[PDB]
Amino acid sequence: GEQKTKPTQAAIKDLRSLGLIPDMIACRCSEELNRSTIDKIAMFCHVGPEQVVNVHDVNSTYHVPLLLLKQHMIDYLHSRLKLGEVPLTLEDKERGSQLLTNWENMTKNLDDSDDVVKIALVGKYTNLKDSYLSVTKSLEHASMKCRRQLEILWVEASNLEPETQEVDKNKFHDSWNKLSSADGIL
Amino acid sequence: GEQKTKPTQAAIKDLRSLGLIPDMIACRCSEELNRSTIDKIAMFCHVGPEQVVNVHDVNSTYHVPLLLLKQHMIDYLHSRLKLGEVPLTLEDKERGSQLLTNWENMTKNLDDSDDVVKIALVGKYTNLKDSYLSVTKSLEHASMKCRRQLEILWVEASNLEPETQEVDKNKFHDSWNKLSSADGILVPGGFGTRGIEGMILAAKWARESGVPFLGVCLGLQVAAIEFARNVIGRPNSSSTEFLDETLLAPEDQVVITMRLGLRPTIFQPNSEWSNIRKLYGEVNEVHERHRHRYEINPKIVNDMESRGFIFVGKDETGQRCEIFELKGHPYYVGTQYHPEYTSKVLEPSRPFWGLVAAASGTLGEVIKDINL
Amino acid sequence: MKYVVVSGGVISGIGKGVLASSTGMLLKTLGLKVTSIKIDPYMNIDAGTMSPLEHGECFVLDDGGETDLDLGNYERYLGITLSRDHNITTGKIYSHVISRERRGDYLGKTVQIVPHLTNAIQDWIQRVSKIPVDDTGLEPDVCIIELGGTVGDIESAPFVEALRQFQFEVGRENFALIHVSLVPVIHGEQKTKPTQAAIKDLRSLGLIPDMIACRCSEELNRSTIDKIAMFCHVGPEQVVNVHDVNSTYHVPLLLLKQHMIDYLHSRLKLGEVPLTLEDKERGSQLLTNWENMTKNLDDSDDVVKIALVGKYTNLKDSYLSVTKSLEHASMKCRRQLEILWVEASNLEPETQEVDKNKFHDSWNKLSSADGILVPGGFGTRGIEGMILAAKWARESGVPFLGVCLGLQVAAIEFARNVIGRPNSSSTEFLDETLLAPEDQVVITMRLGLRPTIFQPNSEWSNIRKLYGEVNEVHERHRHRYEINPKIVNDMESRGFIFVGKDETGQRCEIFELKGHPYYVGTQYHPEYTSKVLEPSRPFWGLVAAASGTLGEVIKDINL
Ligand SMILES: Nc1ccn([C@@H]2O[C@H](COP(=O)(O)OP(=O)(O)OP(=O)(O)O)[C@@H](O)[C@H]2O)c(=O)n1
Ligand SMILES: Nc1ccn([C@@H]2O[C@H](COP(=O)(O)OP(=O)(O)OP(=O)(O)O)[C@@H](O)[C@H]2O)c(=O)n1
Ligand SMILES: Nc1ccn([C@@H]2O[C@H](COP(=O)(O)OP(=O)(O)OP(=O)(O)O)[C@@H](O)[C@H]2O)c(=O)n1
Ligand SMILES: Nc1ccn([C@@H]2O[C@H](COP(=O)(O)OP(=O)(O)OP(=O)(O)O)[C@@H](O)[C@H]2O)c(=O)n1
Ligand SMILES: [Mg+2]
Ligand SMILES: [Mg+2]
C-alpha cells in the first residue's frame, strides 16, 4: 500500500551522471500519485511539483493526451521552450484549435458509445496481438468514427480447419462459434 | 408457507360421490408432505397414512419409479391386489428382478454422469418442445446408455437462412452459434415446409464440417436435397413436397397418398461397412415405424450411389429408399422411417444411440457393446 | 343500508382479510360512513381464552372485548371504532339462541337451525350494521361482511344459508358478493378449475357472486380471465387480480386501477345514498392522503432499525398490532423500516452456557438497533432478557418504548440498576417468596378504552408533546398486575417521573425518564388505536427518535 519513489530517484542520479538534466518526471504508477509522493520526487529531482506528471491508465489510450492537458503539460512546454516565439499563421493556429476539438469530440464519443460491433480477425499467431498492432488500431479508428464500441474476435485460423475436430473439438467449436458470432470478418 | 389439503379433500368428496373409492392419494405438492399434512389427508380420505404417496420433483423423470418404491408402493399393491396369487415362472420373476437392477444401474449412471454432449435439434416450432417429445426422449435414452449427460440445442431452423440477417442479426448469430457449438446434429422429421432452407444449411454444415448427423424422415429428404444442390451440383433441385406446380425436372422427391405403421426395411447387399448396419447388429432386416407421403425420387439413386451417398436400406420391393449412410464421414445417416418411437428406456433406438455415441466419442466401443 | 360480503375460497389461508379491509377503504373514499363485520366459524365466544401462540395476538376493543385479529385490520384501514358484537362467531350465535331457548322466547316451538337460527344471524347483522362507528353517532351507509372459513364447509353452513335469505330479506341492489378464489400455477399454466369448483358450490349454497378476486402468483392472462368469465357469469372486467405489491397499503390502489369503485358505485347504486360535501370532500381528501403515503413508501430509502425484544418472536402474528403500528409510524417519518427480532431469552448470560451463537446474534441485533421496543409480552419466562435490553436502552442512550409489561420491566430494571435493590422483583412471577421489594401488585382484570390524566408538572415530557399537550388521553388497556404505587415517590425523586395516571391518582400509566433523548413506558397498549393515517403517538415518538428529527415531528403534531 505505499508508493515507492526510490527506483525513480536511482534513475535521476544516473540521468544527471550521463549528463542530460530532466524537465518532467512522468511516473507510471499503478495509482494517482500522493501529494506527499510528488513533494518528495520534487525534493530529490530538481523539478517543481507541478511538473511531476502522472500517466495512469484511463478508458482508452486516445484519452492520454487530455490527461496530460489537465496536468498543464502544454502550458509548461509553451513556457519551457518559448513556443510563443515560433512564427504561426491563423491557418496553423485555427487548424490546431480545431484538431483539439476533434480530439475532445472523438474522446467524448468513446465515453458514451455503447452499441457493440464484433469483428472476427481470422489468422495465425493471434496470441501475439502485437503481430497485428496496426490492424487493431485501424479498427479502433473505424469504430470511434461509426460511434460503435468495438469487440475484436480472435479466430486462430487453423482451428476452423475440419482436421482440428480430430485433435481437439473444443478448439473447433470455439473458433467457429467466434466466427459465427461476428458482425463482420477480416 | 402452509400446505393446503382442501383442493384434495374437495376431489375425495367428488370421487366418493361419482362412486369409485380411492386406494392411494398421490399428491403433486411443491415439497415433501409434512407428517401432519399426511395425517390430516388420512383423516379426511379413508386411506392409512402410509398410502399418501408424495410424487415431488427429482433429478430426472427416470428416478420417479424408485421414489414410489421407497414409498412402499409395490409392497402395498402386492397386498391390495393379492399379486402373490398370480402365476409366475422363474423366467418371469428373474426377468423382473433383473430389469429392476437395470433401472437401479441406469439411474445410478445418471446420478454421476458429468461429461456433456451437445446435440443440435434443427427444425421449425422449437418453442413447442412437445411437438418433438419422442425425439427428446430417444436422445435421453441414448445419452444415459453412452454415460454422457445431455444438452439439446434448440435451433429454430428458419434463423439459419441468410435472409434472417436482413430481419434480426441476433437470431442469425444465436442460431449459427448453437449449431456451431453442437457435438452432433439432428434434423428431427419436421412437418410442413416453411423452415426447409435452414435444415438444408445445417445438412451442408454437417457434411462439410464432419460433425455427426442424423436425418429422421424429412431429415433424410433435406439431406438428399443438400447433397444434390451442393455435391451433385444441381442448385435448382427441389423438394417436390414444396415446389410442386413449377413442374421442374430435378425433383429430389415424389408423392407415393400415405404409408404408416411398423414396416420391414431390408439392407442392400454391399452394406457390410455401414456404421448404421453395425448399430442394427448386422441383422439383414429392420422393423421400425413409418410416416411419409413423399419419398426420395428413385431415379436419382444411381447417381448418389456413384458419389458415395449409398442407400444402405430399402423397402422389400427395392423401389423405395429408407436408409442412407455417406461414405468417408464419422457418422452421417438418413432414416426415412421414424426411429424415435421404438426406443425403450433400456433399449435406445439404434440410429439415436449412433448419434449420441459419435458425438460423445467412443462410437467403436458402443459397436462392441451391441455386437458382444 | 348497503352490504358487500367478502367470501369464498378453495382454501381458507387465501387472504380475504386484505380484500375486505381494502374494499371498505375504497368505499370510504366516496365519503360513505363505512362499517365492517367479521364472521369467524370457530366456536370461541371471544378470543380471550385462546393464547397468542394459537393463531396470533389477543386484540382489545373499547368495550374490553378480547377479539379476533381481523377486527384490527378494519379499524386501522377504515379509521373506525368497533364493538365486540362486530365479531359474529359460531360460538356466539349458538350460545345466544341456545341461551334464548332456556329463556323461552320461541314460545315453546322447535328451534330448528334453518328458519330460527338463520333468522338470528340475519337479525344480528341488521342490528350490528346500525351501531355507529365514526367520531359522531351517525349510522353506517355500507357494511363490509367478511365471511370467515370457506363457502363449501360444515362450520360455514348456517352463515351461507343465512346469507342466501339475507340476499332477499335485504333487497338485491342493497347486497353484493365478492368471491375470493384460488388460481394455481403448475408447469407455467394458470389453472382456473379450483375457482370453477367453488363457483359451482357457491351457486349451490345459493348466493350469486359479483366479483371473482383471484389470488394467483401472477398477472392473470387475458385468456384466463375470459374463461373465468365463461364459467362464472361475471363480465371479464370484474375478475379482479389481487397479486403481491411492495406493501399491503398499496392493495386498495390496485383495486382502484381495476375499476372496483366504478363497479361497486354501479352495482349498489351508491349515487342514491345521501352525502354532504363534508362527507364527499373528506372522502376525496382521504384518497389523496392514501396516494401521498403510498408515494412516500415508493421512494423512502433511509432505513430505521427497531429492536422488538420479547418471547415467541418466531410467531410474528403474536405481535401483529405492534408490527403494524411501527409501519404507520415509519411511513409518517418517511424512513423505511427494518424490525430486529430479538428473542429475549437469548440476551440472558446463561445462554452463553447453552449456545454462544444465540447470545451473540441477539446482542448483535440489539446493539445494531436505532431504537428499542419491549412489546407487552405474555407469561414471564423471557423477563431477564427484557430487563437487560432496558438496562442497555437507559445507559447507552438508545430510544426506548415499553408497552404494558415493557413499562413494568423498565421499573424493575430501574429498581435493580439505579435505585440499587438487586432482589427487587416482578410480583407477576416471584410471588410466594413474599419479599418486601415488590415492583408490582395484582389489582382480577382491567380491560378496554380507559382515561389517562397527565400529572401536573408534565409540561417538559416528550410523550406529552406527542399527545398534543392535551390533559387527558383515551387508549386501550390490558393488565392484571400494575406498578406497586409505594415505590413511585422514590422513582419521582430519581428522575423516573410518572407523566400520566388513572383518574383516582392511585394507578400509574405513563412514565418518561428525565435527561434521555426518548425513554417511555406506557402501561396501556398504544398499538391498537393506531390508524394508517394517524400513527399511535408513543410509536410515532419511537420511530421519530430512532430516525432523528423528533423535534420536527413535534412541530408536525402541534401546528
Ligand atoms: N537518497 C536517499 C533517500 C533516503 N535515504 C534514507 O533511507 C531511509 C529509507 O529510505 P526510504 O525512507 O524508503 O526513502 P524513499 O526514497 O521513499 O524510498 P522508497 O521510495 O522506496 O520508499 C530514509 O528514511 C532515509 O533516511 C538515504 O539514505 N538516501
Ligand atoms: N371439511 C372441512 C374441513 C375444515 N372445516 C373447518 O374449516 C376451518 C378452516 O379450514 P382449514 O382449517 O383451512 O382446513 P384445511 O382442510 O386444512 O384447509 P387447507 O388445506 O386449505 O388449509 C377449519 O378450522 C375447520 O373448522 C370444515 O368446516 N369442513
Ligand atoms: N391489510 C392486510 C391484511 C392482511 N395482512 C396480513 O395477513 C395476515 C394473515 O392473512 P389474512 O390476509 O389476514 O388472511 P388469512 O390469515 O389467510 O385468513 P382467511 O383467508 O381465513 O381470511 C397477517 O400476517 C397480516 O400481516 C396485512 O399485512 N395487511
Ligand atoms: N367444467 C369443465 C371444464 C372442462 N372440462 C373438460 O376437461 C378438459 C380438461 O380440463 P381443462 O382443459 O384443464 O380445463 P380448465 O378448467 O382450465 O382446467 P385447469 O384450470 O385446471 O387448467 C377440457 O378440455 C374440457 O373438455 C369439463 O369437462 N368440465
Ligand atoms: Mg387449515
Ligand atoms: Mg384472515
Q: Same domain, yes or no, for C401 and C498?
A: yes
Q: Same domain, yes or no, for C332 and C470?
A: yes
Contact between B177 and A173 using a beta-carbon 8 Å cutoff = no
- Give the end of a domain, one of C239, C274, C290: C290
The values of phi and psi at residue B15, to 5°, are -65, -50
Alpha helices, DSSP H, located in A23-168: 35-44, 64-70, 73-80, 90-112, 133-146
Nearest to B139 by CA among B131, B148, B130: B148
Under 8 Å between Cβ of B251 and B238? yes
For residues C180 and B296, give the distance between their C-alpha atoms in angstroms, rounded to a whole number.
61
Tell me, what CATH number does C121's domain have?
Answer: 3.40.50.300
Q: Same domain, yes or no, for C278 and C299?
A: no
Place of cell 394507578: C507
The values of phi and psi at residue C522, to 5°, are -125, 125
- Interface C:B, ≥3 CB–CB pairs < 8 Å: yes
Amino acid making up residue C102: R
Place of cell 509548461: A76
For residues B180 and B208, give the distance between their C-alpha atoms in angstroms, rounded to a whole number.
12
Contact between C186 and B2 using a beta-carbon 8 Å cutoff = no
Name the 3-class secondary structure at A112: helix
Nearest to C59 by CA among C90, C42, C81, C78: C81
Of C146, C404, C413, C482, which is the active-site residue? C404
Q: Same domain, yes or no, for C343 and C234?
A: no
Work out the angle between the directed axes of helices C537-547 and C320-333 (0-180°, nearest 10): 60
Q: Establish whether residue C201 lines the binding site of ligand 2, counting it when its CB lies within 6 angstroms of any ligand atom.
A: no
Under 8 Å between Cβ of C233 and C210? no
B63 is catalytic: no
Quickly count helices (H) and strands (E) in chain A: 7, 3
Nearest to A146 by CA among A182, A115, A111, A180: A115
Nearest to C84 by CA among C115, C61, C114: C61
For residues C508 and C439, give the distance between their C-alpha atoms in angstroms, rounded to a whole number.
12
For residues C254 and C266, give the distance between their C-alpha atoms in angstroms, rounded to a whole number.
19
Q: Same domain, yes or no, for C61 and C85?
A: yes
For residues C461 and C498, give the distance between their C-alpha atoms in angstroms, rounded to a whole number.
10
Place of cell 427416470: B62
Nearest to B333 by CA among B358, B364, B366: B358
- Enclosing domain of residue B231: 108-371
Distance from CA of B209 to the nearest CA of A (A): 6
Q: Same domain, yes or no, for C208 and C302?
A: no
Q: How many CB atoms lie within 10 A of CB B344?
A: 9
Instruction: Please give the torsion angle defined by the CA atoms of residues B224, B230, B235 and B238, in that order, rounded to the nearest 10 degrees.
Output: 10
Which residue among C153, C181, C182 is best mutated to probe the pocket of ligand 2, counting the most ligand atoms within 8 A of its Cβ? Answer: C153
Nearest to C526 by CA among C462, C468, C473: C473
For residues B124 and B242, give the distance between their C-alpha atoms in angstroms, rounded to a whole number.
15
Under 8 Å between Cβ of C426 and C408? yes
- Give the end of a domain, one of C270, C290, C310: C290
**Which B residues 141-200 touch C at CB under 8 Å?**
none
Strand-strand pairing, C34-40 and C87-89: parallel
Contact between A176 and B173 using a beta-carbon 8 Å cutoff = no
Q: Which residue of B has its CA nearest to A181?
A: B173
Q: Same domain, yes or no, for C277 and C411?
A: no
Under 8 Å between Cβ of A128 and B176? no
Q: Which of A174, A176, A179, A183 to mutate to test the interface with B (most CBs of B within 10 A)?
A: A176
Q: Which residue of B has its CA nearest to C10?
A: B7
Angle at CA of residue B28, ends B23 and B31, nearest 5° = 120
For residue C7, give the C-alpha cell.
Answer: 367470501
First to last CA, chain B: 55
Indicate which atom in ligand 4 lies nearest the CA of residue C192. 20
Q: Which of A162, A173, A183 sits opposite B180 (nearest CB)?
A: A173
Strand-strand pairing, C447-454 and C440-442: unpaired
Amino acid making up residue C87: N
For residue B245, give the C-alpha cell.
Answer: 406446380
Strand-strand pairing, C447-454 and C472-478: antiparallel
DSSP E strand boundaries for C66-184: 87-89, 142-147, 175-181
For residues B6 and B221, give the distance between their C-alpha atoms in angstroms, rounded to a whole number.
54
Calculate the alpha carbon distances from B100 to A21, B106, C88 in Å: 89, 10, 60
Place of cell 415509519: C330
Bridge partners (DSSP) listed for residue B263:
B288
Contacts of C320 (CB under 8 A, 6+ apart): C56, C57, C69, C72
For residue C197, give the C-alpha cell.
Answer: 369448483
Q: Same domain, yes or no, for C275 and C303?
A: no
Q: Which residue's CA is minimally distant from atom 10 of ligand 1?
A: A6
Contacts of B63 (CB under 8 A, 6+ apart): B107, B110
Under 8 Å between Cβ of C198 and C231? no
For residues B28 and C559, give the distance between their C-alpha atoms in angstroms, rounded to a whole number.
60
Quickly count helices (H) and strands (E) in chain B: 13, 11
Residues of B in contact with A162 (CB under 8 A): 208-210
Q: Which of A165, A177, A181 sits opposite B210 (nearest CB)?
A: A165
Name the 3-class secondary structure at B347: strand
Q: Which residue's CA is minimally distant from atom 18 of ligand 1?
A: A6
Which residue among A4, A5, A6 is best mutated to probe the pocket of ligand 1, counting the most ligand atoms within 8 A of its Cβ? Answer: A6
Contacts of C308 (CB under 8 A, 6+ apart): C319, C322, C323, C339, C340, C341, C342, C373, C375
What is the structure's resolution, reported in angstroms to one decimal?
3.7
Q: Same domain, yes or no, for C68 and C185?
A: yes
Q: Same domain, yes or no, for C124 and C257?
A: yes
Residues of A in contact with B179 (CB under 8 A): 180
Q: Same domain, yes or no, for C231 and C337?
A: no
Q: Establish whether residue C100 lines the binding site of ligand 4, counting it when its CB lies within 6 angstroms of any ligand atom.
A: no
Nearest to B295 by CA among B217, B208, B203: B217
Bridge partners (DSSP) listed for residue C213:
C180
Q: Establish whether residue C192 lines the binding site of ligand 4, counting it when its CB lies within 6 angstroms of any ligand atom.
A: yes
B27 is catalytic: no
Q: Same domain, yes or no, for C245 and C138?
A: yes
Contact between B177 and A181 using a beta-carbon 8 Å cutoff = yes
Contact between B10 and C197 using a beta-carbon 8 Å cutoff = yes
Ligand sitting nearest the alpha carbon of C153: 2
Q: How many CB atoms lie within 10 A of CB B319?
A: 11
B217 is catalytic: yes
For residues B353 and B360, give the distance between their C-alpha atoms in angstroms, rounded to a whole number.
10
Place of cell 424415435: B340
Place of cell 435452414: B198
Q: How many CB atoms lie within 10 A of CB B204?
A: 17
Amino acid making up residue C332: K
For residues B321 and B266, give the distance between their C-alpha atoms in angstroms, rounded to a whole number.
10
CA of C192 to the centre of ligand 4 (A): 9
Tell me, what CATH number does B271's domain have?
Answer: 3.40.50.880
Please count the structural domains in chain C: 2
Calculate the alpha carbon distances from C169 to C38, C130, C206 in Å: 20, 16, 14
Nearest to A68 by CA among A131, A18, A26: A26
Rg (alpha carbons) of chain C, rounded to whole number: 25
Of C86, C179, C477, C525, which is the active-site residue? C525
Place of cell 490492424: A135
- Give the end of a domain, one of C225, C258, C290: C290
Q: Is C424 left (phi over 0), alpha (psi -120 to 50) or beta?
A: beta
Q: How many CB atoms lie within 10 A of CB C419?
A: 18
